[PDB]
């Protein structure tokens, strides 16, 4: 209801999972309620991976034709497109959460899995639509939510949207893009075909959750690990390895300025990848900002403890 | 760990030095404050709330 | 230990005379007692003199203010020790040089403790690590010893001023660094606001 | 004569595996030290160290 969906109700989850209304019509889910506290945990886990793809797991309940996204945690799996069937790593976390919830009188189970698709916008490719169909028949219900961390920086728009892939025997023959975003000139042909496999849902927001309340009691004793900075020695191989890739980009810029993408008859459309000098500038600054970021964590340590001395 | 020197016949043992020892002393120093904070609040819980209000008053 | 320190201070204040002389040798022989400040300032040990009673008073002063070379110079005037009292004196010699200097070279401990190698010299130091007595690290490149945690010998009645002086620079020192970090955030945020305004007003006048 | 032409390469590959398991602990190892453990003359040690 209105005031019952804001809290955890045991009678609401006992009249839905026992009857399973999703087995009659696959288009039962219309809206999706994502907690405001869990949204910050999904945009922070995908931002730490950078250009890579990561996956996680969401927990919550149901209340009719609207899903509830309560708590959510990260997963050590390297996304879903790289590693086929990424739900095998979450079996150890689910076996320890359901057993600890049935003893206290709680029927909260799995609600969906979230990932990240940086680069080609927030959509479902041909790999995510195949693995989701095999998980909805065993661990129901599920929902795929895509978060773009590298798109809310330049454009400034918080990309968020939940989708659900239709199973075999219910896909529409013709359906336009429900949630259309930006796609680079490379995989735009697959957007007009794979859009009929899933559909967008009107996302909502509410305040509840429970995971955002026990992290303060842990910080009272785990604060000695949060100060473990010094990023200059952690990913030292990634900083030096990025300079090798910069030399290959700088060599391509020399041939771009020599030949020139402005010829007679057909200009500004000669070379494949134009503006090589402008793109190589951001790549050179990436190795500089990441190098001075690790030093700032060391200078700040030599100004608070090393400047004390002794009499 | 360690290496063996065949010139003078003196075997040395590795006990960590240089940069890896700098982060170990910082984590060990901050760990002593965490254990000391649990002892102050256990022996005298009234002094923990009084010391926190002194920073907000200044 | 910590529970044994409250039992030796109660038996010395209840009896005196010949019973106090026998209690001094039982404290130094029994392990766990690493403090001798609360027993030296008492008036029970000060009344022991004239004969063998005066030797126990001088031995208690060497275990708190003296070192290892200070005992071998007058071993004939002081009573002998055993396999446990001699090893306890070497633990107090390491914490004695740490109160004056931060780092102690290996050549200093090799002469005071009279050794020949480094492992045998550090053998008496690692025994105090598991008992929460001496905690620190060993340096091999500089051949020094950085003592971090150690016993305070007595009740610290003279070097207690360095405790408040070190904590005052840690609390007041954080205010000077906080003013620089907060000023850097305002300077970095103001540069982004001025750059966003100067990049949008210069591009809108190109069409006009 | 078929296996005789390859009997020399098989003997040289064994000396390379033993030199790896002995050069890790010893930092500055002596040249005649590896010749005494392998029970070989010093004539082929100088030629094998260059190829290794």
Swiss-Prot record, chain A:
Q: What cofactor(s) does the depicted protein rely on?
A: a divalent metal cation
Keyword Metal-binding assigned: yes
Q: What is the enzyme's main class?
A: hydrolase
Where in the cell does this protein reside?
Answer: Cytoplasm, Cytosol; Nucleus; Cytoplasm, Perinuclear region; Cytoplasmic vesicle, Secretory vesicle, Synaptic vesicle
Q: Where is the motif (JAMM motif)?
A: 115-128
UniProt GO MF annotations: deNEDDylase activity; enzyme binding; macrophage migration inhibitory factor binding; metal ion binding; metal-dependent deubiquitinase activity; metallopeptidase activity; transcription coactivator activity; translation initiation factor activity
Entry keywords, A to Z: Acetylation, Cytoplasm, Cytoplasmic vesicle, Hydrolase, Metal-binding, Metalloprotease, Nucleus, Protease, Signalosome, Synapse, Zinc
Cellular component GO terms, alphabetically? chromatin; COP9 signalosome; cytoplasm; cytosol; eukaryotic translation initiation factor 3 complex; nucleoplasm; nucleus; perinuclear region of cytoplasm
Q: Does the keyword Hydrolase apply?
A: yes
Residues binding Zn(2+) are: 115, 117, 128
Positions of the MPN domain: 32-169
What InterPro entries is this protein classified in?
CSN5_C, JAMM/MPN+_dom, JAMM_MPN+_peptidase_M67A, MPN
- The domain of life is Eukaryota
SUPFAM superfamilies in UniProt: JAB1/MPN domain
Please give the CDD domains that the UniProt record associates with this protein: MPN_RPN11_CSN5 (cd08069)
A Pfam cross-reference name: CSN5_C
Supply one GO BP term: positive regulation of transcription by RNA polymerase II
Tell me its family: Belongs to the peptidase M67A family. CSN5 subfamily.
**Note on domains (UniProt):** The JAMM motif is essential for the protease activity of the CSN complex resulting in deneddylation of cullins. It constitutes the catalytic center of the complex.
Q: This protein is called what?
A: COP9 signalosome complex subunit 5
Origin species: Homo sapiens (Human)
Encoding gene (name): COPS5
Swiss-Prot record, chain B:
Q: Which cysteines are joined by disulfide bonds?
A: none
Which branch of life, at top level? Eukaryota
Where in or outside the cell? Cytoplasm; Nucleus; Cytoplasmic vesicle, Secretory vesicle, Synaptic vesicle
The record's similarity note reads: Belongs to the CSN4 family.
Q: Summarize subunit and interaction data from the UniProt record for this chain.
A: Component of the CSN complex, composed of COPS1/GPS1, COPS2, COPS3, COPS4, COPS5, COPS6, COPS7 (COPS7A or COPS7B), COPS8 and COPS9 isoform 1. In the complex, it probably interacts directly with COPS1, COPS2, COPS3, COPS5, COPS6, COPS7 (COPS7A or COPS7B) and COPS8. Interacts with TOR1A; the interaction is direct and associates TOR1A and SNAPIN with the CSN complex. Interacts with STON2; controls STON2 neddylation levels. Interacts with ERCC6.
Summarize the protein's role: Component of the COP9 signalosome complex (CSN), a complex involved in various cellular and developmental processes. The CSN complex is an essential regulator of the ubiquitin (Ubl) conjugation pathway by mediating the deneddylation of the cullin subunits of SCF-type E3 ligase complexes, leading to decrease the Ubl ligase activity of SCF-type complexes such as SCF, CSA or DDB2. Also involved in the deneddylation of non-cullin subunits such as STON2.
Tell me the protein's name: COP9 signalosome complex subunit 4
**What high-level taxonomic lineage is stated for the organism?**
Eukaryota, Metazoa, Chordata, Craniata, Vertebrata
**Its encoding gene is what?**
COPS4
**Parent-record interval covered:** 349 to 406 of 406
UniProtKB/Swiss-Prot annotation, chain C:
GO cellular component assignments: COP9 signalosome; cytoplasm; cytosol; nucleoplasm; nucleus
- Keyword annotations: Acetylation, Coiled coil, Cytoplasm, Host-virus interaction, Nucleus, Phosphoprotein, Signalosome
Among the GO biological process terms of this entry, one is: regulation of protein neddylation
| UniProt main location, coarse | cytoplasm
Q: Does the keyword Cytoplasm apply?
A: yes
- Tell me where in or outside the cell this protein is found: Cytoplasm; Nucleus
Top-level lineage group: Eukaryota
Residue span(s) of domain PCI: 1-152
Family that this chain belongs to = Belongs to the CSN7/EIF3M family. CSN7 subfamily.
Subunit architecture = Component of the CSN complex, composed of COPS1/GPS1, COPS2, COPS3, COPS4, COPS5, COPS6, COPS7 (COPS7A or COPS7B), COPS8 and COPS9 isoform 1. In the complex, it probably interacts directly with COPS1, COPS2, COPS4, COPS5, COPS6 and COPS8. Interacts with EIF3S6.
Q: What does this protein do?
A: Component of the COP9 signalosome complex (CSN), a complex involved in various cellular and developmental processes. The CSN complex is an essential regulator of the ubiquitin (Ubl) conjugation pathway by mediating the deneddylation of the cullin subunits of SCF-type E3 ligase complexes, leading to decrease the Ubl ligase activity of SCF-type complexes such as SCF, CSA or DDB2. The complex is also involved in phosphorylation of p53/TP53, JUN, I-kappa-B-alpha/NFKBIA, ITPK1 and IRF8/ICSBP, possibly via its association with CK2 and PKD kinases.
According to UniProt, the name of this protein is COP9 signalosome complex subunit 7b
Organism encoding this protein: Homo sapiens (Human)
Its taxonomic path starts at: Eukaryota, Metazoa, Chordata, Craniata, Vertebrata
Query: Gene name on record?
Result: COPS7B
UniProtKB/Swiss-Prot annotation, chain D:
Of which family is this protein a member? Belongs to the CSN2 family.
| Signal peptide region | none
Question: What are the subcellular locations of this protein?
Answer: Cytoplasm; Nucleus
Q: What does this protein do?
A: Essential component of the COP9 signalosome complex (CSN), a complex involved in various cellular and developmental processes. The CSN complex is an essential regulator of the ubiquitin (Ubl) conjugation pathway by mediating the deneddylation of the cullin subunits of SCF-type E3 ligase complexes, leading to decrease the Ubl ligase activity of SCF-type complexes such as SCF, CSA or DDB2. The complex is also involved in phosphorylation of p53/TP53, c-jun/JUN, IkappaBalpha/NFKBIA, ITPK1 and IRF8/ICSBP, possibly via its association with CK2 and PKD kinases.
Name the chain's protein.
Answer: COP9 signalosome complex subunit 2
Q: Subunit info?
A: Component of the CSN complex, composed of COPS1/GPS1, COPS2, COPS3, COPS4, COPS5, COPS6, COPS7 (COPS7A or COPS7B), COPS8 and COPS9 isoform 1. In the complex, it probably interacts directly with COPS1, COPS4, COPS5, COPS6 and COPS7 (COPS7A or COPS7B). Specifically interacts with the ligand binding domain of the thyroid receptor (TR). Does not require the presence of thyroid hormone for its interaction. Interacts with CUL1 and CUL2. Interacts with IRF8/ICSBP1 and with nuclear receptors NR2F1 and NR0B1. Interacts with NIF3L1.
Q: What the entry says about post-translational processing?
A: Phosphorylated by CK2 and PKD kinases.
């Amino acid at each position: 209801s209105i005031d019952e969906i804001y809290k955890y109700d045991k009678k609401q989850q006992q009249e839905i999972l026992a009857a399973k209304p999703w087995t009659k019509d696959h288009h039962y889910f219309k809206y999706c309620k994502i907690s405001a506290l869990a949204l910050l945990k999904m945009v922070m886990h995908a931002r730490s991976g950078g250009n890579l793809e990561v996956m996680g797991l969401m927990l919550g309940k149901v209340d009719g034709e609207t899903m509830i996204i309560m708590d959510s945690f990260a997963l050590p799996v390297e996304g879903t497109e790289t590693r086929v069937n990424a739900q095998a790593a979450a079996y150890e976390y689910m076996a320890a959460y359901i057993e600890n919830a049935k003893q206290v009188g709680r029927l909260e189970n799995a609600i969906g899995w979230y990932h990240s698709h940086p680069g080609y916008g927030c959509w479902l490719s041909g790999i995510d639509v195949s693995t989701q169909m095999l998980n909805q028949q065993f661990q129901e219900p599920f929902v795929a939510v895509v978060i773009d961390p590298t798109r809310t920086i330049s454009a400034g728009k918080v990309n968020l949207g939940a989708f659900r892939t239709y199973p075999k025997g219910y896909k529409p023959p013709d359906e336009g893009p429900s949630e259309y975003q930006t796609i680079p000139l490379n995989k735009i042909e697959d957007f007009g075909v794979h859009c009929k496999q899933y559909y967008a849902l009107e996302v909502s927001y509410f305040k509840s959750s429970l995971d955002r309340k026990l992290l303060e009691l842990l910080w009272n004793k785990y604060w000695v690990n949060t100060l473990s900075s010094s990023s200059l020695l952690t990913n030292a191989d990634y900083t030096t390895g990025q300079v090798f890739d910069l030399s290959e980009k700088l060599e391509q810029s020399e041939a771009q300025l020599g030949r020139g993408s402005f010829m007679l008859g057909l200009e500004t459309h000669d070379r494949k990848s134009e503006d090589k000098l402008a793109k190589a500038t951001r790549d050179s600054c990436k190795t500089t900002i990441e190098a001075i970021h690790g030093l700032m964590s060391q200078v700040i340590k030599d100004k608070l403890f090393n400047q004390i001395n002794i009499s | 760990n360690g290496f063996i020197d065949q010139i003078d016949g003196i075997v040395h043992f590795e006990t960590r030095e240089a940069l890896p020892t700098w982060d170990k002393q910082i984590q060990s120093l901050c760990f002593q404050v965490n254990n000391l904070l649990e002892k102050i609040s256990q022996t005298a819980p009234e002094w923990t709330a009084q010391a926190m209000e002194a920073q907000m008053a200044q | 230990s910590s529970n044994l320190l409250e039992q030796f201070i109660l038996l010395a204040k209840g009896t005196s005379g010949s019973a106090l002389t026998a209690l001094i040798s039982q404290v130094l022989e029994a392990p766990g007692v690493y403090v001798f400040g609360e027993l030296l300032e008492l008036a029970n040990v000060q009344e022991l003199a004239e004969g063998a009673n005066a030797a126990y008073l001088q031995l208690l002063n060497l275990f708190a203010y003296g070192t290892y070379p200070d005992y071998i110079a007058n071993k004939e005037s002081l009573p002998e020790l055993s396999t446990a009292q001699q090893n306890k004196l070497k633990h107090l010699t390491i914490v004695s040089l740490a109160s004056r200097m931060k780092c102690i070279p290996y050549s200093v401990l090799l002469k005071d403790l009279e050794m020949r190698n480094l492992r045998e010299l550090e053998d008496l130091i690692i025994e105090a690590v598991y008992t929460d007595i001496i905690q620190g690290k060993l340096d091999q490149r500089n051949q020094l010893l950085e003592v971090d945690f150690c016993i305070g010998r007595d009740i610290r009645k003279k070097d207690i001023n360095n405790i408040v002086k070190t904590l005052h620079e840690w609390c007041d020192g954080c205010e000077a660094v906080l003013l620089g970090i907060e000023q850097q955030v305002l300077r970095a945020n103001q540069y982004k606001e001025n750059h966003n305004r100067t990049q949008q007003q210069v591009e809108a006048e190109v069409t006009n | 004569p078929f296996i005789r032409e390859h009997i020399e390469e098989l003997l040289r590959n064994i000396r390379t595996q033993v030199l790896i398991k002995l050069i890790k602990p010893y930092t500055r190892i002596h040249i005649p030290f590896i010749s005494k453990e392998l029970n070989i003359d010093v004539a082929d040690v100088e030629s094998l160290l260059v190829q290794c």
